Design a protein around this ligand. Sequence first.
Ligand SMILES: Cc1onc(O)c1C[C@H](N)C(=O)O
Ligand SMILES: [Zn+2]
Length: 258
Amino acid sequence: KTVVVTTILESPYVMMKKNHEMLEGNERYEGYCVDLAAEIAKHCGFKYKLTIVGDGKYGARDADTKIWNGMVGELVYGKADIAIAPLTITLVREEVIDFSKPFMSLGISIMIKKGTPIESAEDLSKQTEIAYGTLDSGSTKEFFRRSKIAVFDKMWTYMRSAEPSVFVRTTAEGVARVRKSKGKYAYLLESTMNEYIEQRKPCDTMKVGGNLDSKGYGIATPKGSSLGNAVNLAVLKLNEQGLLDKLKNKWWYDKGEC
Ligand SMILES: Cc1onc(O)c1C[C@H](N)C(=O)O
Ligand SMILES: [Zn+2]
């Protein structure tokens, strides 16, 4: 009956409202994905319940365990009916779950502390004083692990062996590390997140260089779900009406602190 939506606490997609302890259910959250979930549900005609993914991950398959974690896992093992989050459409994920056409276009980018002498991925690969890493259990880490292009392969070789670990559990952890490391740590994350953080106080970070790739976020459902068709049509309809652009402007720039 009520559609269980799995999502992740990642600003500005899903965040706890200031007054959340005094609110119930869906009303406890706010953000781009909260606004989008309400719209997808209206257009598809279903009631839903937002739930935060238990392990706080996007989703990756464990080598040997072979078990999918994160939001992807919630869909794969039937714990959730749909995932509405900044979840990247990738080949390994699409082999186990279905994705709508993209609701947001983005690419991996570099985040630096203002003043850091780095202008590109090539710059990072060619040096060692400035450490750099990515988020764990996601599409960004897999991009570097599977890349056959020289610069990225060199970056992966360094990242996989760096000590202490250059990988972080959450985006907020990556941003804090950039902010606290005096220019000695750069963070590789999706352009969407980079652009968002660039507009938040203390306004000390910035996106440098172009995107390393081009991809998109999709609304995900278990393979063969009855919801897939309507959800994809809803995403296409909402993008064409300008809603997705209005939502990005609202959560990224209208509320910008810089
Ligand atoms: C958001 C975000 O920003 N940088 C990232 O790697 C991610 C996670 C990425 N969207 C995923 O699906 O794994
Ligand atoms: Zn609508």
